Design an enzyme around this catalytic site. Sequence first.
Site, PDB file in Angstrom:
ATOM      1  N   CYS B 108       0.819  -1.221   0.000  1.00 28.84           N
ATOM      2  CA  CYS B 108       0.000   0.000   0.000  1.00 28.84           C
ATOM      3  C   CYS B 108       0.849   1.265   0.000  1.00 28.84           C
ATOM      4  CB  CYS B 108      -0.959   0.024   1.205  1.00 28.84           C
ATOM      5  SG  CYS B 108      -1.868   1.579   1.334  1.00 28.84           S
ATOM      6  N   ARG B 111       0.143   4.649   2.843  1.00 33.63           N
ATOM      7  CA  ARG B 111       0.238   4.418   4.285  1.00 33.63           C
ATOM      8  C   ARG B 111       0.635   5.625   5.130  1.00 33.63           C
ATOM      9  NH1 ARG B 111       4.053  -0.633   4.685  1.00 33.63           N
ATOM     10  NH2 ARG B 111       4.527  -0.011   2.523  1.00 33.63           N
ATOM     11  N   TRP B 280      -9.289   6.768  -0.488  1.00 36.34           N
ATOM     12  CA  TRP B 280      -9.580   7.523  -1.694  1.00 36.34           C
ATOM     13  C   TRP B 280      -8.637   7.056  -2.821  1.00 36.34           C
ATOM     14  CZ3 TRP B 280      -8.202  10.181   2.873  1.00 36.34           C
ATOM     15  CH2 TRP B 280      -6.859  10.571   2.971  1.00 36.34           C
ATOM     16  N   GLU B 285      -5.146   4.286 -10.673  1.00 36.44           N
ATOM     17  CA  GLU B 285      -5.925   3.078 -10.472  1.00 36.44           C
ATOM     18  C   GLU B 285      -7.082   3.060 -11.463  1.00 36.44           C
ATOM     19  OE1 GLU B 285      -6.443   1.738  -6.212  1.00 36.44           O
ATOM     20  OE2 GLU B 285      -5.881   3.826  -5.844  1.00 36.44           O
TER      21      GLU B 285
HETATM   22  C1  HEM Z   1      -6.167   6.651   1.949  1.00 35.42           C
HETATM   23  C2  HEM Z   1      -5.795   6.498   0.680  1.00 35.42           C
HETATM   24  C3  HEM Z   1      -5.239   5.172   0.100  1.00 35.42           C
HETATM   25  C4  HEM Z   1      -4.604   5.106  -1.063  1.00 35.42           C
HETATM   26  C5  HEM Z   1      -4.306   6.312  -1.980  1.00 35.42           C
HETATM   27  C6  HEM Z   1      -4.223   3.727  -1.295  1.00 35.42           C
HETATM   28  C7  HEM Z   1      -3.559   3.273  -2.408  1.00 35.42           C
HETATM   29  C8  HEM Z   1      -3.338   1.950  -2.679  1.00 35.42           C
HETATM   30  C9  HEM Z   1      -2.952   1.405  -3.957  1.00 35.42           C
HETATM   31  C10 HEM Z   1      -2.746   2.227  -5.254  1.00 35.42           C
HETATM   32  C11 HEM Z   1      -2.787   0.096  -3.795  1.00 35.42           C
HETATM   33  C12 HEM Z   1      -2.416  -0.900  -4.902  1.00 35.42           C
HETATM   34  C13 HEM Z   1      -3.762  -1.526  -5.233  1.00 35.42           C
HETATM   35  C14 HEM Z   1      -3.961  -1.974  -6.654  1.00 35.42           C
HETATM   36  O1  HEM Z   1      -3.140  -1.617  -7.528  1.00 35.42           O
HETATM   37  O2  HEM Z   1      -4.967  -2.691  -6.906  1.00 35.42           O
HETATM   38  C15 HEM Z   1      -3.107  -0.250  -2.402  1.00 35.42           C
HETATM   39  C16 HEM Z   1      -3.049  -1.508  -1.819  1.00 35.42           C
HETATM   40  C17 HEM Z   1      -3.442  -1.854  -0.541  1.00 35.42           C
HETATM   41  N1  HEM Z   1      -3.974  -0.954   0.388  1.00 35.42           N
HETATM   42 FE1  HEM Z   1      -3.985   1.095   0.246  1.00 35.42          FE
HETATM   43  N2  HEM Z   1      -4.667   2.949  -0.230  1.00 35.42           N
HETATM   44  C18 HEM Z   1      -5.308   3.823   0.651  1.00 35.42           C
HETATM   45  C19 HEM Z   1      -5.926   3.481   1.844  1.00 35.42           C
HETATM   46  C20 HEM Z   1      -5.908   2.253   2.443  1.00 35.42           C
HETATM   47  C21 HEM Z   1      -6.632   1.861   3.642  1.00 35.42           C
HETATM   48  C22 HEM Z   1      -7.576   2.786   4.443  1.00 35.42           C
HETATM   49  C23 HEM Z   1      -6.332   0.571   3.865  1.00 35.42           C
HETATM   50  C24 HEM Z   1      -6.750  -0.382   5.005  1.00 35.42           C
HETATM   51  C25 HEM Z   1      -7.195   0.066   6.186  1.00 35.42           C
HETATM   52  C26 HEM Z   1      -5.405   0.151   2.832  1.00 35.42           C
HETATM   53  C27 HEM Z   1      -4.838  -1.088   2.722  1.00 35.42           C
HETATM   54  C28 HEM Z   1      -4.274  -1.617   1.586  1.00 35.42           C
HETATM   55  C29 HEM Z   1      -3.947  -3.014   1.455  1.00 35.42           C
HETATM   56  C30 HEM Z   1      -4.107  -4.134   2.510  1.00 35.42           C
HETATM   57  C31 HEM Z   1      -3.389  -3.179   0.054  1.00 35.42           C
HETATM   58  C32 HEM Z   1      -2.895  -4.540  -0.506  1.00 35.42           C
HETATM   59  C33 HEM Z   1      -3.614  -4.834  -1.816  1.00 35.42           C
HETATM   60  C34 HEM Z   1      -3.486  -6.269  -2.257  1.00 35.42           C
HETATM   61  O3  HEM Z   1      -2.507  -6.961  -1.864  1.00 35.42           O
HETATM   62  O4  HEM Z   1      -4.366  -6.730  -3.033  1.00 35.42           O
HETATM   63  N3  HEM Z   1      -5.179   1.189   1.977  1.00 35.42           N
HETATM   64  N4  HEM Z   1      -3.412   0.925  -1.762  1.00 35.42           N
HETATM   65  C1  LIG Z   2      -7.170 -10.804  -5.888  1.00 35.95           C
HETATM   66  N1  LIG Z   2      -6.947  -9.442  -5.355  1.00 35.95           N
HETATM   67  C2  LIG Z   2      -8.183  -8.830  -4.933  1.00 35.95           C
HETATM   68  C3  LIG Z   2      -7.930  -7.469  -4.432  1.00 35.95           C
HETATM   69  C4  LIG Z   2      -7.694  -6.377  -4.013  1.00 35.95           C
HETATM   70  C5  LIG Z   2      -7.337  -5.234  -3.528  1.00 35.95           C
HETATM   71  C6  LIG Z   2      -6.984  -5.204  -2.150  1.00 35.95           C
HETATM   72  C7  LIG Z   2      -6.612  -3.984  -1.575  1.00 35.95           C
HETATM   73  F1  LIG Z   2      -6.267  -3.963  -0.283  1.00 35.95           F
HETATM   74  C8  LIG Z   2      -6.577  -2.818  -2.346  1.00 35.95           C
HETATM   75  C9  LIG Z   2      -6.938  -2.861  -3.680  1.00 35.95           C
HETATM   76  C10 LIG Z   2      -6.906  -1.547  -4.449  1.00 35.95           C
HETATM   77  C11 LIG Z   2      -8.116  -0.687  -4.144  1.00 35.95           C
HETATM   78  C12 LIG Z   2      -7.893   0.500  -3.219  1.00 35.95           C
HETATM   79  C13 LIG Z   2      -8.268   0.399  -1.881  1.00 35.95           C
HETATM   80  C14 LIG Z   2      -8.109   1.469  -1.009  1.00 35.95           C
HETATM   81  C15 LIG Z   2      -8.528   1.320   0.443  1.00 35.95           C
HETATM   82  C16 LIG Z   2      -7.593   2.661  -1.497  1.00 35.95           C
HETATM   83  C17 LIG Z   2      -7.218   2.742  -2.851  1.00 35.95           C
HETATM   84  N2  LIG Z   2      -6.707   3.897  -3.352  1.00 35.95           N
HETATM   85  N3  LIG Z   2      -7.381   1.674  -3.675  1.00 35.95           N
HETATM   86  C18 LIG Z   2      -7.311  -4.077  -4.256  1.00 35.95           C
END
Ligand code: HEM
Ligand SMILES: CNCC#Cc1cc(F)cc(CCc2cc(C)cc(N)n2)c1
Lengths: 409, 411
Positions: B108, B111, B280, B285
């Site tokens: 992520c 963070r 957000w 994305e």
């Molecule tokens: C606040 C603005 C946030 C932004 C801009 C953001 C951005 C992103 C992006 C661009 C990814 C890659 C996802 C993809 O390409 O599909 C990601 C992954 C992830 N985000 Fe964040 N995120 C945000 C908030 C959060 C929040 C609130 C949580 C959990 C409480 C979180 C947890 C995660 C997790 C667990 C992944 C792993 C995705 C996976 O392995 O499939 N994010 N995030």
């Molecule tokens: C097989 N994989 C399924 C899946 C998945 C996934 C998990 C995640 F933790 C975040 C995102 C990307 C969507 C996202 C989520 C948040 C909270 C913010 C953001 N900018 N984009 C995708």
Amino acid sequence: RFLKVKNWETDVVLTDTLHLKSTLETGCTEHICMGSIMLPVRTKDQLFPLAKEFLDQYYSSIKRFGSKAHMDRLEEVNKEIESTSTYQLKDTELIYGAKHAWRNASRCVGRIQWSKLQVFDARDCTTAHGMFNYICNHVKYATNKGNLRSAITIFPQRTDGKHDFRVWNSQLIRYAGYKQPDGSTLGDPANVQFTEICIQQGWKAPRGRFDVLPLLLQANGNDPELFQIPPELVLEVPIRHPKFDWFKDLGLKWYGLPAVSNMLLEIGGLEFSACPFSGWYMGTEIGVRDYCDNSRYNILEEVAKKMDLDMRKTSSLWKDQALVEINIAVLYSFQSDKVTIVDHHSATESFIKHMENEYRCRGGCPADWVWIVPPMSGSITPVFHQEMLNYRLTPSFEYQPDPWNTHVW
Amino acid sequence: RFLKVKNWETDVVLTDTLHLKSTLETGCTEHICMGSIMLPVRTKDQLFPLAKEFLDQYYSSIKRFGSKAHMDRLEEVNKEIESTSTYQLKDTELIYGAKHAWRNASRCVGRIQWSKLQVFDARDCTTAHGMFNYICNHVKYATNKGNLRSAITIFPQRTDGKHDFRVWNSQLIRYAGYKQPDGSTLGDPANVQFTEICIQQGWKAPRGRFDVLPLLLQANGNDPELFQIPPELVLEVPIRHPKFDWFKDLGLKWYGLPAVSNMLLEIGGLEFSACPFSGWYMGTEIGVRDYCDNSRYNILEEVAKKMDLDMRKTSSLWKDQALVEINIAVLYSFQSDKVTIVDHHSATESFIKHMENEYRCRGGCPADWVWIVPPMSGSITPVFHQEMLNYRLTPSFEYQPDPWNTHVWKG
Ligand code: HEM
Ligand SMILES: CNCC#Cc1cc(F)cc(CCc2cc(C)cc(N)n2)c1
Ligand code: HEM
Ligand SMILES: CNCC#Cc1cc(F)cc(CCc2cc(C)cc(N)n2)c1
Ligand SMILES: C[C@H](O)[C@H](O)[C@H]1CNc2nc(N)[nH]c(=O)c2N1
Ligand SMILES: C[C@H](O)[C@H](O)[C@H]1CNc2nc(N)[nH]c(=O)c2N1
Ligand SMILES: [Zn+2]
């Protein structure tokens, strides 16, 4: 232990068995992945198993595993090591080893060409003037008036570590870098230290922004010597845009021949510390990295200005827009001057096809995703969606220390 | 032991010690790196060390390690595990847990925001109707009329694995995909299989290109039930381009709230199989992946056609050109409608500052380069040049299988 890789764009799944033949270490452990780390004197003991492994795969490849010619060669090398504390490769084995070192280069997207490599045996070389001669011949052959051809030139192997052959340049052809009293940087900032060691060694620089550096060549462990590559052997391309006629006045150019000269080639335990090799460019190497890296020529701002983009807010994506136009021009310029170049769309599509070829005929293809995915437009290229396994096979190219840090002067 | 990472643009070197507290494995070995691979019922036995380690972490963070509060809580949890074979988290522990799962999420890039997460406790929920209500309230809160706020809603933990709470949707808000008889796809190709399930479960499909899917919600291991999110709660943005007036005529829109609903939250050995969270969007994305992936809406060609680019040779970079214009339009549209969004330049810059802060105050920051580097313009962002170490810390978010593959139907 028989591993699967998936392409998430096409659902194609390949099964990797080649990794089981791997031997060297990756840097990774089950507790930590070092996948994005840039960089993670042999005795008689270590040598014969290495030679044996190599000869085994060589005789396998020519369908003579378990042949008397195989046993005899193994016999002969074994007694030669026991005697001479080393051994010499047959020409055929050398060509095989070099081609397979490229085949095994997990960071190289261009490997579909691996079997069409011209190998120049320079193992009879004794002096820096002779090295210069071999290198001029290499450059001329490879350049071929713009119709580039892959080549490697291999100098004598390491003996006792005090008699090493080395090319001090990182690439055969690169531009000088000078830090100005102003405090700025004239030319290529990446080459400032080396440019110093050329001047601090005798060079007289034109102190321009695109001066081709001289060769600094080290034979048999002696002090390195300066040589100027004949300008008529260095093919350069002026950079113009097919739409913006103001692009000319930027004064940009680049050379046609990418030729890496500071790597170490390992074959069957033997080490070749001087082994310059060359291919042809992928467009993004020049347009994205050389021109737009902040620690390089860093021209983004200037180009953006001449395009009259809104550079007040990053979210206007003015950097992204300029980046594309710069890269359109690099390709356009090379193409127009009939100098071989490949765009990142074509090269990555080639690599997917190479991967499927290798999985089908060899059972795998070691690949480093972090290096294989291009530095612009990543996810619209097929390699972005391709799972890859990274592991180390030999024969191989390896990194080695910069000579000036090692050379007892 | 110590480990160093280097930024190759700035030569800043950092030292990681936090990796010593790593537990779970990566998939890699000394002989193979699995760094680009997408993917990798619990007894009394393994649970109390997992609980103890979590409670040690918690009481350390509140400067109360070894206090009588700490010792009493350990003894209380221990007895509860030996008595009931599980245990319940206090509210404070739950909040801490959910925040640190985000803080630990190595994929992520967002963070820097981790400490400002709104945690909604839904552990008293018992039915699918109750789940619907909690989820509506989460969406209203998080959306905040376009001024997005990060949030997570946490439903009851797993017990015997036969009574799971699950949101069957991969994200709370998503568009339907429909396979046509001629083999073409209407809507979002990513959601075709899920759309089919919804229809089979009795959803009446509008069959348009941007139909918001119904929620399919499973409480206490019962069969999932269908619910429609009130349209007034789903904020959407019409996509237009600041210079190209024909762009609006492409008929594109997207929703404002990215809300992941299929992951598993692990805290102190407890497993929360339903834990939707939202933040957000980063522009890419939507603009790069959602619109331009070949396996998604795939609009590069029509956009390139209307720009009248040279589409004959790929070396014209007509794809790269159209890709940039689309991402300009996504950002412009969101900003103009005052819906929170961040571009990939701002986001990566913030992440580097976050990472450096975490190294100094925490001893490290686990990060997955393959996911952190944006899918366009990679090397002109600062994260491209940054060495990263990837390792697993708990609390954590984990993948779990799709529920339709494991569910035992009641009928
Ligand atoms: C606040 C603005 C946030 C932004 C801009 C953001 C951005 C992103 C992006 C661009 C990814 C890659 C996802 C993809 O390409 O599909 C990601 C992954 C992830 N985000 Fe964040 N995120 C945000 C908030 C959060 C929040 C609130 C949580 C959990 C409480 C979180 C947890 C995660 C997790 C667990 C992944 C792993 C995705 C996976 O392995 O499939 N994010 N995030
Ligand atoms: C097989 N994989 C399924 C899946 C998945 C996934 C998990 C995640 F933790 C975040 C995102 C990307 C969507 C996202 C989520 C948040 C909270 C913010 C953001 N900018 N984009 C995708
Ligand atoms: C013929 C066309 C070729 C193309 C288009 C090509 C392309 C590339 C590119 C883009 C990289 C990434 C390097 C960087 O970003 O700096 C690379 C790495 C590499 N290439 Fe190739 N290459 C070609 C030929 C060759 C040949 C002929 C050899 C050797 C015989 C070779 C060996 C390597 C090695 C060893 C690396 C990685 C070295 C490292 O770790 O830094 N390549 N190649
Ligand atoms: C700190 N690391 C510095 C480095 C490096 C490097 C090594 C390589 F082996 C090739 C290239 C790219 C140069 C190149 C070489 C060839 C033969 C072809 C090509 N297209 N590019 C860069
Ligand atoms: C830190 C990171 O590993 C480093 O910036 C790498 C990333 N990927 C790369 N990929 C290529 N092809 N060339 C490079 O120099 C780099 N640099
Ligand atoms: C094969 C590869 O791991 C896969 O395509 C990854 C690459 N990096 C990614 N990065 C992000 N942020 N999101 C993704 O879906 C992916 N996909
Ligand atoms: Zn790894």
